[model samples]
Target chain A: AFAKISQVAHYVPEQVVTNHDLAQIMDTNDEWISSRTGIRQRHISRTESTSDLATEVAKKLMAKAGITGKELDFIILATITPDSMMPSTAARVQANIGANKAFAFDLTAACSGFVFALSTAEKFIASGRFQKGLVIGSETLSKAVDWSDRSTAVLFGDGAGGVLLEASEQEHFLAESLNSDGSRSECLTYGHSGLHSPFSDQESADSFLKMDGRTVFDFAIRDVAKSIKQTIDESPIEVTDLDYLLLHQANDRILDKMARKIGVDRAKLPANMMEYGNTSAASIPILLSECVEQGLIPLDGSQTVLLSGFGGGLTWGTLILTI
Target chain B: AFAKISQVAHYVPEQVVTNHDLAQIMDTNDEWISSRTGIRQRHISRTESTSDLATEVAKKLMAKAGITGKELDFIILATITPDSMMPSTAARVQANIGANKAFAFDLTAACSGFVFALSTAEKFIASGRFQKGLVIGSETLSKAVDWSDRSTAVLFGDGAGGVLLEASEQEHFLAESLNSDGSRSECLTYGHSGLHSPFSDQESADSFLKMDGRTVFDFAIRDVAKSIKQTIDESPIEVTDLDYLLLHQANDRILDKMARKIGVDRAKLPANMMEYGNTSAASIPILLSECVEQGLIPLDGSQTVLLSGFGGGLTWGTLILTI
Candidate 1:
């Protein structure tokens, strides 16, 4: 048995902070931001937590799948900006959606979280013990960012997206390659829970997102591109046979460089970073949801797509999905 | 096509804090704490982060298995007291041990993390795409607890424990049942990342662990007990045929009540809270490691052990392992 992506949905906070709006708070302007990172605006949470945004996406995925929450065998939510460290943002979504039967938890892989989570959910369904599950990528990164810092602040957004996985006869998961480099973990850091114990400890670091954009971009262009190409070769398809190259919406330049390096057409590598900035984990799923709705990529098992997510654990993952 | 537990190891910080030690700072006594929670002393992190302790376990597991770090296919670290939310503790261990080829991530399900993580690692190996992985449960609950609050401060310890999983011909994973009730999520919560967005309307909640002991205890004695019985029945062996029952070291009384409810002898249910004082996610694996060292349980595929972890996602998971 295998697993298939049956439905997709996404939710972003209502408040949109434009590049011009960011200029009012910091020293960055729309032209400087838009030309470099391709981010025009980002959705910032005004009234929601990470769990709240995820709950909305979970509800939509279930509704579109025409299944009750009770039918969900598991819920795996991937995010860095969790509302709390204990109950798990996934547990909060399970509670909010009344998924009493689903065992919920959270996964953290930073930007690569969605792909990592999707691959994991596939494993559970492929085992045949679980028939249906929800794989979600949600982030309220606005909470983790230093609003006063223009470098990293304007680059993140608050949003959630997810896919519904159900048992299928044919393999929906064709191939996957997940990679992590902890040596470069310092390239991107967020929400450090510093050693707060009173027992002769070190001082607590700031709990804000930090990025060495140059280092991360280089890693993406070199390592992420290679992983995608290798993963595509491992699958029963070539770059030309792919219907979509859904790379993480980190930057337009990174995506362009990667697509070119992997020999995929620019049009095939659809991007939405212009509207959402870097939602981190939410980027890929939210883009997928948009593509599904726009008729660019149908969920009828007639097309093959390669989804890649890269950034913060200095991690990267690429997976081929036939859906 | 199956996965088995090949090696196990654990690590705790150098600092040991007894109830008497806690008494010096808070309004609590050893008799009151020991009789109520079965906790006498706990290992507290004097200098190590959650990642520091977990890396030790990873190194030990790899050394026992006689494999290089690069041979590892994946690493899954389960914890609530992670050093940072971005570079997952798993990724740090991956880096620390030079597991350059492995894909690492973190899972959070409160105390049930090890079981849940073990289950997840089993899925990856069972998929036949991966060969060797590390499923670790690590925590530095000392950082999350309110040091002034005697109710919770004395109940948690800092530790890390893990097992190495390798592909095998026989199914070491006999049966499993994982459960969560989100409505009761409020029964236990810690590290709430309250809305910090400048556009937000709410203040941040304290990032401290809180618990409703009464509700959690009732849920464990009832729901957790039922899940264990049902999962055992789902497996091939009967409860009487089990060699040992390893449970989360939350409380001695809960373990006793659960054993009676499941018709298992007290000897079959091992308790180590007296020494470790509830390491949260690390409890089960730590206990398993000690059992292996003590010769109570062997890793020669001759023992049928049932391991269960319960607590804060209001989450509980039970899995039967043939080791």
Candidate 2:
């Protein structure tokens, strides 16, 4: 048995924050932010939690596939920003959507989380145990960002996206390569819930996002390109044969650089960071859903696509599949 | 190809706190605490982070296996008490031990996390895409526990434990069953990192662990036992034929009740809650490591063992295998 992408859906909060709005509060402007980060506006949560956004996406995915929650064997939600530490955000999504039979949990790999979760859910289905599952990338990154830090604060948005994976006779997964450089973990960080025990002598770290742009930019251009190249090398088709290359919507510059580095046409890679900035783990799946709406992906097993992501954890992953 | 448990190891913090120590600050005594929870003394971290404890366990496992960090294919750390929300605790351990070839991430299912992670790693290996990986369960519950809440603070301890998995020609895994009831997720919870954004109108929840003991205990006996029985039914052996049943070290009463419900001899189930309280996700692997030391598990693939875990996420899982 193999795992096939059955459906795709995504949801972003209704509250849209434009560069002009950020300029009113922080030290930036529409012209400056748009020119530098290629981000014009982002969706920020008003009353929605990460789980709330994910539940909407899950509902849409189930509705689109015409399946009930009981049909799901598992649910893997990936994010760095969760609703709580105990009952995972994935668990909340499961309950909210009444996926009573699905075993749920959360996976954290920074922005690479969605790709990591997709690879993981595929394994269970391919192993002939689980028949169907949901791979969700959801994040409420606006809560974790430091509003005072304009550089990092303006680069993130809040959203959730997911895909329905079902067991099929023909395999959809082609090849995958995942890598993490913990030595550079300091390049991007958020919500450090440091030690707080009575015996703990260590001080608690701040609960806000921080980033070293130079380090992250360099890592994304170099390591992310290398991972995508490695995955393409393992696949039957070359990079040029891919119908779509959906990368984590971090920045337009990184996307352009990666396309050049991997020797793929810039047109083949689609991005929406201009509209939603970096939704972190939610970026790729959200982009995938949009591609489906645009008829770029037909949910048929004929189109070859590549998905890649990179960010905090200094992590990067590439997955080549037929959709 | 199959994944086999190659080696097992565990580590706890140096600081030890007895029920008497907890009574000093709370309105409870050792007799009351010990009789109700089967906990005498528990280790508490002084200066260590969750990653610090897990790093020790990883080093020990690699050293015992006589393998370098470069030999590892992946690392999956299971925990809710992470050092930060960005660079995963698993990534820190990966970098600390120089596991340059390994891509690491954290899996969160509360207490059932280790089993969830083990099953996940097994899938990667069984798929013929990966060869070897480490599944580590580490938690510093003390950091999340409400020191003033005697009901929970005295029931949790700090520790880390893990096992190394490698590809084998023979199948060591017998059968597995995993489950979750997100409807009962409120039974156990910790560290609610509430929303805090410019647009967010939601209030942040408290950042401390909470539990409904009656709900968790009842779920542990009923649901956890059902998961185990389902897994055993799928296996070739009966519950009576198992050499040892290692469960998450939650409570002594739960273990006794589970044994009775599953129709297995009480002696077949081994527990260490008396010495360690509940280490959450780290409980099962920690107990497994002790069983190795006590000669209950030989690590020579001769012993039939069942590893089970249950708790927050309202999750439960069972894996029957040969050690």
Candidate 3:
């Protein structure tokens, strides 16, 4: 009863900054960043807000799907940098796009946001209360990273990706698995620095994003492989029948390790970070769109694909879809 | 088949500040502030993060609901001021409360956050996917408010309210009405200042909250009345049969006017701003909990009450619950 993605749109900033440009400020070069993370040039939203990229993608998706704003029941935004602390960036997108009938808000699950949001939207559509929903995975990580800190700044980028899920009777999508381990939250977190903090007087005005990179990388490889295996084992389809594997674009090494662990061939694993870097929550859909646009993933009739995402909630999730 | 509020909990900080305190900081008098907003005194979270209040409330509510953190399928926090731009406050709350099995994130809808969250939670339960869920409305408005501006500064407070929803077959909660008008987005928005701006040179580290007070006041009075009337009409019960009216805590005058407009007797309207002030998203649930504690709302099986909330995002929502 839940609708599948009929159309998708991705927006990367026009200005591309290479690792060499980043090395001017930080202590990393193109070869070092690429060998360690497989990031070449990331699309930085230097001239726009998170909403600007999101708005463009929303408009493009709506147009491609041939649906009006009034048809949408709700708009769910998955983002880390909202325009404000209040009102939500989704509302602004709604306003900017004239989505008068839809209620909007933002959801945060870090890099796992797209998969998390897709699952949430699927449930809403399945409930029969919502006919159509807009889910956008967007982020402006440039603002959250500490450029002066070489440990975290080199691995981030800004972009937005979206899909339109409308009511459908076709069973084109399979099951999903979402899990969280709060105990590991400290491995990737941004400490509070404002008025609500105990050390508010001593803290800086802006909080910097922090991460225990080695720990996260280790966990990412194991969890991503485990989650995908768990999803595949529980699925009705045989593991040998799976055609594509789309993983969250975090680190290329982790992705490669998971692909190897899951016994999936390198040819079946699709990646987009060589051009877009790690767009965080926007990674999945942005890569999803890239695969579709490249004709690497056929949109013809029936194709089974495994999707998985893992990120900063210490969260991990996987879903199987037929396209 | 759906989750109900199996248990609830709230926490207001120990440090109290009255309208008199506002008089000392700005050119306003205690009597003036009290008469206009009905806020006598309010709690300020001293030496604590918003997540701290949220964690306490979540822990207590989980205990009261008689469920372990492992049983919670998901955690949805409705707030504007998160601890950071990433790793959401809800994630931290999930960590603090040891809800390792649940996926968590923040939802932003301003004052109507609780209602929006309740609707979202209901979908998850109604879909027959999750058996138990946690929804929290928390805020630390002091961090966002421009203290130098007396008009907006004196009208806010900080606190957290929480409720646990468990799957049940009870049908007393008749209907819900949620609406948003993005045309008024600018009426209640905090300026962007932290990061992700085109003109970073003009960005100030301190981003303060701003509101078109009179516009919000007028919109609130009219919409609150409209939504309640519509909700009651859609519900199985009539407006005249309602035992009580619960409105979001923002301005007493708006609430009073709405009561008159709906022909609800002042006695039937339950408010606590005189003691707790405006708790933002925490307002309605905290007020509901207070009534439950005071025995004003009976614990008996069949009591019909009307609940409504309106706030930032230019959002408004209503629900009828039978207890």
Candidate 4:
């Protein structure tokens, strides 16, 4: 049996920060930020960690799927900013939700995290060795950012979003192209490490989010668009046949440019970065849940959705799902 | 086609610290450390990040496998102490070795990491969607250990090991069991999180390794043994038919007790924790690689190996791989 997402849900941190709020402390204003990245405000965590956000979403995901915690066979949380590097943020979510029957783990792929995790989970279901599972894309990028650096700080938020997958007859997951370029890893980075070896005398790298925006932006349009095109080319449908393109909510310019490069209608590609900024791994799932709420991508398993993720590692992926 | 290890290798930091060496720094002696845990010495990295150790292992893995970096379809690195949580230590290894064709990500399940990652990789191969990939278990736990806290500090070391999984006929991967108990997570953990929210004043959780040794020891002998037995029971062969059991090298006493409980000969489990201490997720693979070097488990695909891992997340799992 194959698998499909039986439910989708999202949870944004209660505290919201507007661009004006940032301008009060930094040298940036709402106009410049909104014009450049199409981001007006973001949900910042007031007292929550990545696990807190994920647990709330997990509760909603389980409730919406109409299944108890014991019904889950596995739980995979994709994130860059975890509550801890040990015990796993996934374990905390599993513990918080009382998922006694599920084995939990964390997968890290930066912003493309959710896509990598979703693709990985599909294999588990595709193997016909598992039944039901939860795939969550969550982040607390605010904790990793250099708040003093306006370029990286104002562009990220804290939130979690996820879906519940169940075994099915027809395939919901079609073709996919998951790829990465470690050579460009320096294009975006965070959570730096210092040498502990007594054999060397290197200091710790700055532990904050950093990015070469110019490099990342271009790569997204060129490499990511190609990845999407190739994935669709391998699918049973043409690029034009994609009903909706739910992309990683990094930037509005990249979205419009990638859609144009791939020869898809800009309208077919949704945009919500204007409302929530970029939530890193949480972006796509958050967008998916929002779309479901707005009836853009219905849960009736009828739409041919094009899902894509691109970010640090310099990792990127594009997948076609019939849902 | 199913999956089998085509090659295996490991790299430990050249610096070895004897229990006598640790005794000088703390209030403990060699006899005290060795008699309780069966560890005499351990390889401790003085200047390496998790990526540095993994990169060394990846180089050896590719060389031993007679394959180039580009030949790998995926790279799943299991670690609790990653170089950077953002780019992933796997991506760093990918970049350093020029693995342009491989999609890499980091998996964290604490000590059960490698086993969980191997299971996930099996699905990718079982789906026949991927042919070859790298499953690496690597860690630099020294950085996360609080040296002053002698209890947790003396138990961990730094190293890396991995295997190349390739598609083959006749199903080398027979059956498996993977599980977790988030409720027991406090028994073992590192890198705790305190709220970093701007509106909160709560102190952050200490980002260091900690464990309830007595609790974990009991869990290993009781729970982990049962998991291993159940996994073997589910396979085509009986528990007695298992040719070799490569269990996680956490505690020597626990290993002997677990073997006795499961009715397996202690000799079937080759342990080297005395040389590497508990390298967390790297423990099992490092031992497997050492076994390969000694010709205990030949790479000619003729050994029935039972690989089991148990630890933080309170996670545990087992797999049957005939290779």
Candidate 5:
């Protein structure tokens, strides 16, 4: 038996901020933001915590599947922005959704979180110990990023998305390639909330999100492309054979560059970054859910999908699955 | 093939804070702290990020195993206190220890993190996906707690501990029971590092850790022991048949009470909190390494050990293994 993607869902906060709205606060224009990142508008949470966003997604995914939360064996939340340091956001979602019998935890790998988390859930299901699970990628990037920093702020949003992975007799998870490069960790950074001990020499912390955009963009286009090609080839399937390529909704240009370099038809690459911007860990699954719901894609067991996620940790990963 | 505990190691900062020392800073004393928690002194990091402590542990674990960082297939850091949210503590450890070939990520499940991480890593190994993995429980609880708040601060210490799990033909991980109840998440919490966004309703944040000692104590005494019994029973191993029980060192009294309720001989329950306090996720592996290094136990697969962790998220779990 193998793990298969059964259903997908997403949840974004109610408040939406357009590029024009951002321009009112920063010295930027909608055209510049759209031309560079293809982000028109993105959701920003007013009060929702990371777990609150994920719980919404979990509730929707469960309802859509016609399954009760009690049926879930695991709830794996992928995020860099969590509700708290303890009680993990996953546990919050578990409690919020009432998945009492299941185990839960939060995974952090930046934008690579969702793919890494999905790969992990696949491993769990394949072990035959877990029968069904929620692979949710939820983030409150709006709470983490630097708003005045136009270079990075406009590129991210707050949202969550996920898929239900269940036991299957036929193999659907075709191939996976996950990797991390700590040497490049400095390219994208967030300060830890630290040093409250009386003995601590560093008594304060700067917990804002910061990124070397040039470095991340270049890495995303180059390394991410190679990861995708390698994972698809390892599946022993030709790149052209993939029915769809769901790259992380990081940037419009990066996605275009990645597909061109990997030789996949650009038409096969569907993007939702125009609507949600870069939701970081929430990007890929959010994109997946949008496409599936809008009838732009079908998850009805006939499509060959290649999902990829890349970002901080300088982490990059690819998963090829037949849905 | 199954995942086996191949090597174990831990690292604590040189600075040790006894209950007497704590009294100098708060309204607490050695007698009260010692009698209630069974803790005398605990190591607290003076200048270490959560990742910093983990790197030391990882390096030592690798050296003791006669292995290199590249030999690792994955590095799963289980911590509530990560170096940063973006790169993940695992990512920093990867860069720090030169685990270039392994994919790494940080996992959060509060005190139950280590066991949950071990369980996740085992599934990867059992799936025949990963061969060698580092399941490290590292924390800098000193950074998160309210130092002046005697009730919480004295109950935690900073340290890192980990086990090297390598694939083998023999079955060592026999059974696991992992669960979380988010409804009790508020019983223990460290605030999220939140928004500086102009749209945010709350402009500032409070990222301090708090705990309801009464709620946690009562829960650990009941649910944690029940979790332990159920997990071991699933392994078909009688409670009397187990050689040792390594419980999360949250409190000295909790340990004693848990042992009695589980009907296990007090001699079979090992603890190290008297020296390290409750290092949250780091407690179990710290205890394990202490026992192994002091020649109190061996890793030759001759002894049956039950490793259990319980705390925030109201999370509690047990792993039945022979090592």
Candidate 6:
């Protein structure tokens, strides 16, 4: 009962805020934002919450896949902006979508959350313990971001992406490789204002989303290439045989550089940052759904693909599959 | 290859604060605390984070288990109070304990987190994917509580409990059941804030722990009895054949009531709440370790045990094992 992605749904909020709009607030311009990140306009959820967008995406995906809420055995939502720390965002999503019987929870792995959640759901489905699972990578980064800070603010957008995984006896879905390094913990992090703080200090509110962008960019580029290579090498398929390379949509340079380093054809590596911006954990699956809808990648059997993600928690993981 | 709980360790901080301590701060006394919850005194981590206690417990558990940091495959820390939202408490625990090779993350299912984590570790081990995993249920509820509120403050204590789960082929460790009810979300929940709030007022810190005490109490008693019955009825052994019942240490009244409801002898239901207080997710394993040390639970083969827990997210689950 290894799970296969049956359908995907993605929603970039209706409100389109362009680089020009960001330029009006920050010191950066449209040309600068475009040249550095390849993001011209991004979706911002001005009227909706993360769960609102997530439930919208999940409902659409389940409907498209022809699966009812009752049919779902489990729901795994990956996000950092949960509604509360107590009743997980997954529980809220379950309630929101009316999946009463499906047990649910959230997994936090920063931007790599989608890959981590997908691999986790796949394992349970593969074990024959569950027949179907819903995995959603949703983030309301606008709430977490420091708007005045150009280093991070202009780089993020709010959205949700979902994939319905159905248990199947298919043999083509290959192995996955996941790795984490704590030594690079400082490279990207949301430091301060947690249980660890000794004082009930109110000043650390600005520490919501801070990152060593340069260190993260360097580490991300190198690891993205390395992880994809290692994951494909571990599988029965060779690098040249992979039909698609769906890398995490973080930075255009990082994605382009890694695609070149791995010697993959530029046309085969598809990205959605220009339209949706970097939605953190929601980026990859959103890109995947967009690509699938555009017919850039086929959903037919025996079509081998490599998926890789790298982000906060200093985590990097890759999954090789045949859809 | 199922993961077995190889070693367990718990550390309640040295400072023992009693209900007398509450009398000085609020409208409560020793008799009120003891008669209501069966809690005498509970440890409060002095100037230490939840991760601090977690690191200490993880270090001791791993050392006793005789597994080096390098050999540990994954680290899952279940906690409601994390050091931060980004680099999870699990990551800090990984760094603090020098577990350089392990990938770590925090999980939140309120009190049921430990069981969810154990079930997850079991799956990873059973898949032949990972050999060693560390699951720690740690919390610093003092930070989450409104100390002035008499009803909730007296119900929580700070501590960390850990279990080292190692791959094992033994048939003694069997079956697990997990369930969540989001429809009863409001029956026990922290009020939602952050992005979901209509007013973008920064006046309120969006996330903090809150609960409906009566609703939780009623749910706990029923679910605990139901889970125990379900696991035993489905297992190869009869209810009378079970050796011990290790339940989540919330309140003594609920535990005693559940024991009666399940038709189990009160003497056979081992508890550690007198010393540890309500450790939330840490309750079961800590109680298990204490009972094992006190010779209340036999460790030899032919010992059948029923384990159950219920907590925030309105989650409840059980596991039946034969030692």
lDDT on C-alpha atoms for all candidate structures: 0.91, 0.90, 0.79, 0.88, 0.88, 0.77
Candidate 1's docking class is high
TM-scores for all candidates? 0.99, 0.99, 0.95, 0.98, 0.98, 0.95
Question: What tens-digit string does per-residue lDDT give for candidate 2 at A1-323?
Answer: 79999999999999999999998889899988787778999999998889999999999999998999999999999999998988988899889888988999999999999999999999999889789899999999999999888888999999999999999999789888889888888878887767777677876666699999998898888877887888898788887789889998988988889899999889999988888989999999999999899888889888999999888887888899999
Candidate 6's residue-wise lDDT over A214-280, tens digit each? 8888887776687777777778889888888888887888878888888887778887888888887
Higher-TM-score candidate of 4 and 6? 4
User: For all candidates listed, what's the TM-score of chain B alone?
Assistant: 0.99, 0.98, 0.94, 0.97, 0.97, 0.93
What is the full ranking by DockQ, best candidate first?
1, 2, 5, 4, 3, 6
Clashing pairs in 2: B301-B323
Residue-level error in angstroms, candidate 5, position B230: 1.6
Native contact fraction per model: 0.81, 0.76, 0.50, 0.70, 0.79, 0.42
Off by over 4 Å in 4: A196-202, B197-201
After the best TM-score superposition of candidate 6, give how far the Cα of residue A255 lies from its true spot, in angstroms.
0.7
Poorest stretch of ten by lDDT in candidate 1 chain B: B197-206
Predicted candidate 1 versus true structure: per-residue lDDT over B174-200, tens digit per residue: 899988888899989998987786677
The order by descending lDDT is 1, 2, 5, 4, 3, 6
Candidate 3's chain A scores what TM-score? 0.95
Model 2, B59-92: lDDT tens digits are 9999999999999999999999999989999999
Residue B285 error for model 5, in Å?
A: 0.3
Best by lDDT: 1
